[PDB]
Symmetry: C7
């Protein structure tokens, strides 16, 4: 059994989950690191300075106007001056969104690690016996359990619910703030405050990234809905039933009565692991 031992690793992750993970979590991290690399290659703020100022006072003006980040208008008190804090706060939101989106994929394993592996191992061992009524009675008990169905459905729906947060915040940022210049007003005269106008060269790129992320995240939300409806309603085929050719009449009406059956979920992992069963081709040609 050296060959079996060397290839004893069993796939426990459907390709659809991998596609969803790649399309949802991995790409935003790459975009965030690209934005960070671009942002740490230039000075943060560029703006003007009167003639009388020395170098140190100019440095203080730049630092203060970057730290405060508050606009000003003529004839209006400071109680109504607009702010631009999210222009500086944006990337950390995406950094947190990556993890909050990744949580469910890690959550599923802690519940599906062992039981599914044991059941799959037992079924694959049993397939050898049927090549030539312990198994017949097993389907009756196993086919009325709906624990796996009640868990697989829960994982997918939670992704849809958690997707309302990132889209809502990005949608209200893309079409709300377009300002790029403001009149910073530092108040101090330790020899009538002076006024400067400053520019933010960190906005023409973050605008584009916030637009691509909306489209990419919305497509993944739609593709989940179409697969879920088709899977549990329209599909009336089971892989295990086709390759067995010996099923009792007592299991006929049960299968088309309710689709919330354990054997429905178990049918996929056997299909995706058809390599490990060596009697598939020989048995298929018999019929």
């Amino acid at each position: 059994g050296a060959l079996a031992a060397l290839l004893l690793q069993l796939k426990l992750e459907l390709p659809f989950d991998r596609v969803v993970t790649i399309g949802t979590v991995l790409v935003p991290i790459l975009l965030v690191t690209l934005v960070f690399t671009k942002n740490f290659a230039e000075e943060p703020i560029y703006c003007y300075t009167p003639h009388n100022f020395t170098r140190d006072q100019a440095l203080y003006a730049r630092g203060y106007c970057w730290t405060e980040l508050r606009d000003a208008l003529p004839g209006v008190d400071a109680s109504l001056w607009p702010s631009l804090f999210e222009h500086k706060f944006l990337p950390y939101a995406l950094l947190a969104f990556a993890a909050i989106m990744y949580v469910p994929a890690l959550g599923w394993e802690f519940l599906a690690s062992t039981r599914l592996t044991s059941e799959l191992n037992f079924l694959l061992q049993e397939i050898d016996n049927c090549y030539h009524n312990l198994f017949e009675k097993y389907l009756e008990r196993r086919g009325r359990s709906n624990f796996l169905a009640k868990l697989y459905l829960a994982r997918h729906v939670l992704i849809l619910l958690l997707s309302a947060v990132p889209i809502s915040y990005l949608c209200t940022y893309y079409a709300t703030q377009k300002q790029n210049e403001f009149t910073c007003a530092l108040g101090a005269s330790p020899d009538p405050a002076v006024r400067v106008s400053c520019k933010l060269p960190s906005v023409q790129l973050q605008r584009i990234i916030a637009g691509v992320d909306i489209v990419l995240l919305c497509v993944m939300n739609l593709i989940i809905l179409v697969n879920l409806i088709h899977l549990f309603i329209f599909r009336k085929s089971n892989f295990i039933f086709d390759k067995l050719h010996k099923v009792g009449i007592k299991t006929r009406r049960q299968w088309r009565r309710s689709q919330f059956c354990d054997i429905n979920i178990l049918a996929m992992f056997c299909n995706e692991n058809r390599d490990h069963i060596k009697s598939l081709n020989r048995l298929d040609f018999i019929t």
Copy 2:
């Protein structure tokens, strides 16, 4: 036994412990490293300088006002000037809190490494024999021991007690330190001391981090309490008893008389390692 030897590793850590560790220790390290990366990308302090000063005197003024970090008020002596030391000392507190929270996880292993492994190995070896009165007398002696219960309870209750320190310090920091500008007063005239006002651009981000960490640490404190009560009081089921179908009358009343039973802790570990026993499915279908 090549297949068994290749997979001879036995799980020893419960999933709940892993969840608690991830939710308690790992995240604050990431937040601290993010804060450090942000903080080491700018100057420490920006502030003003009179016209007569040269460059070196301005540099000395900046350094002295950063090092002293003391406020000033008119008409008040130096004996009552407020300080702002937390704004400089904050991150190391979190750095120490990470380790002081991580200690119990290391402490558990040094006491539970070997005995639990040996007992589990003996039990899993015995399960083969019961498929077809050493075990009958074994439960009488083993069921009256309470060493594991007296240790598992101690590990969880210690986390709750140690959680009073980090929360108490962070709560009083959130609602007390709100100042951002002060009038530093350096006293020296080696040709009536001059006065400058300085700004700290390292406070608008540390405020937010100190708020998220409170909520995250408080939720994990509550989730521990609910699980402890349910496991040791309300749950009246043992995994080993259900899959054996052979229990003496004498051991029946001892099970519900007290809950501090050694078999109770052993029951959970066997459930999470049900893969290693190959007679589970065959024996379950018998009943």
Copy 3:
């Protein structure tokens, strides 16, 4: 079976796919990283400054004229001033093009991982028996399937369709914009706006890279078309039929009627994996 177990890995990617991948995806990444390395070794913009300006105002002028990146002309309002944004936006387009071109290679595996491996394993196991009528009837069912053919054609035809985007954008950039100098006009006089003329030293190299990429990507588009026509139309030879020497007359007219047959794709993989069969040389010399 230690020797077989050690060399249990089976080749799954055809050499043509590897050649296409190397010629399409890998090289643009190297060109992009070379461009980035060259571009991050100098200042972004070089230009002039009047005599009255101090240092800080000159720095502000440089930064503002780099950020705006807008031309100016005499006697024309600002509503018709040309822009040069792609000179700054170019490399990220190639960075995205690399991945959007690489997608189909990753897409192929998720569908061709298991079934092809199982079929190849069964055929290689069986080929020992033919050395000395399940196989005779096997070609009847297998030879009328066309799933693999309907998938292999889809992968190649999708590369050609996706090649219209990168070619169109690069073609309209190489021979449209050749400007290198412009008269930036910053408007502010907080003591009649001053005017400066600036130079972009990041255009003489990106022009050459955009030319080589056009030729390299166009050649791979042509080489795919010639191979597709030859493989499915002109080639009238099958590897298995040549080395079997026992085929019924029923499979003769079927093979010469339609080329959209499943064994045609399976023939190539067996030929490239002729090492794993040890009866090839002995059987070939028999005829």
Copy 4:
């Protein structure tokens, strides 16, 4: 014996030694590296400069006042000026203290590597035989050797003696130096020496580190003393004697006549390696 060969690594380090090492050696290295990281993020010394000085003379003044590091007072000659050298020399003392504390742990292995392993292997091999008078006479000779006891006691007592150096120096430093400003007086007039006052921004953090290390190192000194007395005086139980159930009366008097017995040290090692013996549970239930 593949399973035995794969797990042939026998534990040789007691958990108490690991706890002492972690509590004594590892933590000071982390504190030292934290101090170094903090210290290499700022200029070494900040201080003032008269108006007539140019830039180069100011740089020389800073460097000279940092290098000399000597105080000054009015009306007192240079023969009585206080110094502050250890403020600069502190971290290397801790760096050396780490290694000088770590020496004994490395020293013990070179003497305890082989003999203990050989005797433990012999005992573990023999335990199989006793399941069903070489061993009876073996304890007579082995029980009268005190080499291991004479070595284990020496290792622990040496740690206590070596702990007088690091505590004495740190304790006498925490409460002798609170100065932070001094009046550096550089003497040179290459056109009545000028005087400047300088500040050291590397003292408010090294004070706290030198306080924590005192408490942490002192607690580990106390915990060693309590364990040594309990193990060699109060404890009147041997693991090997309890699990044998076949012992002679001749060894009874020698058991509590003297505690410097070889089997006493071997008793702990067998207890912590109870996994490697498979007859423990079966033999224990017999009594």
Copy 5:
């Protein structure tokens, strides 16, 4: 067969190919990286500046005269001003020329990875049979094939053809351009253009590297020609025919008629893998 399995790797690359690769491809990469390391340790251009210029105008002058890289002469219009472009472009051309020459090594592997290693196993296996007429007729069919000869010849001749590009370009660069100074003329007067003379300190080292690479690449071109003629024409010896001692007269005339035989190429590979056959020494001493 553990010893055979452990040493199952078969050499499939003649030493001559390794020598050619090392002498042709590897060295230019080292020279290019040395040139890059030297060139990225100094400023690109040094030159003069009039007295009235400030710092920013001098920086613009340096940058503009580096970017334009155009000479100037008195009394001649700008349409005939000589250029010095390739002084900035040489290293990238060297990298491209070092990377292009790697195609044949990859092509040979792609075209002969499998067939040679599949065919050689039969010859290595049959040695046991010949120790004590399948092989007699085997050489008749195998000795009349010329596919391998038609491929080995193509690989070597293709190296010679692609070697005419690097030699032609480097030869016309070593003895054409020796200029080192020029009179850059920037035209702009935002208050009769000023004139400066600039120096390129990146030409005295690239001259030497372009000379060594000519000699090294030319020698490898000659050594290939002499080996090709000797192997296919003058050499009248076959390794297999010397170690078999049983060949028919039919195979005699054909071997000396045409040298374009598959057995000729297979002779060298068997000679370099004489270790894997253990009957060589015993059979050799028989004759």
Copy 6:
């Protein structure tokens, strides 16, 4: 023999050699790297500059006074001016001393790699036979060879001889070079040479390192001498003779007639590898 194969590694290095290596070679490398890290964290030389000097002339003065490193005195010609080259040349001396001290340890292996291993393997194989007159006559021939003794003695004495160089140079450096200030005199007047006084802030730490290294290297010299005398003169016990209990009278008087015996060296190696013989404990209890 899987267990023997897994642990087939035989120790071929006495612990004393490891202790000497750690105490002699490893520590100076750590001290040198610490000195280098300290030395590359500050400017090399600090000193004064007259008022009329500009920045570039001050930089030239610093560079010249650092390069020349020559003192000056009033009324004395340049032929008698003292030098201070050691303060700049010191670390490379230690860097070379490390290797010149490490040479013998590498040298011994090239001569003791194979013969000792083979003879030890033969002896360990033989020990099995003696459990139940080839060996009786073996000691007669083996006991009259002194090759191993003539080599082990030579390795240790060469260490003592090579220790005269590093100690002699360091001792004369500690008590001779104490200067820290000098009056550099650069001679040039391209408008009576000016004079400056410079300070070297790289001497207060290299003095302490040169003191610790003297004590550490001297103690290791003494510990070698005491062990050499004890091993070859006072010790009158052999491990192989004690555990054999069967030696002829002919081998008795030759044992203490001369101590330059091969079995004397082999006695130590067998003792350190007592684990590999499993009959030690059983045979020892027999007597």
Copy 7:
């Protein structure tokens, strides 16, 4: 044969070759990297500057005088001005010398890889048979081959011939150029050329390195000559003949007639691989 398979690696490199390589090739690389590390930690050239020069012209002057690197003298035209190019060109010469010296060691393997291993394996296999006339006649044929002798001599003599280049260039550099100052004369007056005096602080260390390399390389040249004469002329002993005790009278005078025997080279290799033969000690004691 698991033990033999695990230790199937046969030594092929003689210790003398390893000593020559480590003494010739490895050390110069370390010296070159030390020189590079020293040279890349300071400014390249320190040079003076008149009072009227601005900052940018001073920056130009240093670079121009460093690039030209040409001396000047009064009353002599530029046609006879000495140069100092090797002061800048030195390290690359050593970098190339390392590789040109390393070539032969890599060259020898491509010719000695296979046949030596095959012959050694056959002989070691044969040694088993002689423990109890194919081998008798083998020495007659093998003893008259001189291919290995004609190759081993060629490898060593080529090292001596290639040693004439590095020594000749270094000897003519140590005692030819000792200049350290020169009067650079930049000619340009774009408002009678000015003159400055420069300095090269990269000469006092390259002088010492060029002195050590002469001695180290010359000693290794002498040690090769003495070993070559002793091995092939004076030594009249063969290891294989001593341990066989069975040589014909025909084989006696041939060995003492000519020393260019293939068995002579093979004898040394067997001596260093005496571990792999287990009958060495048993056979040696027989005589």
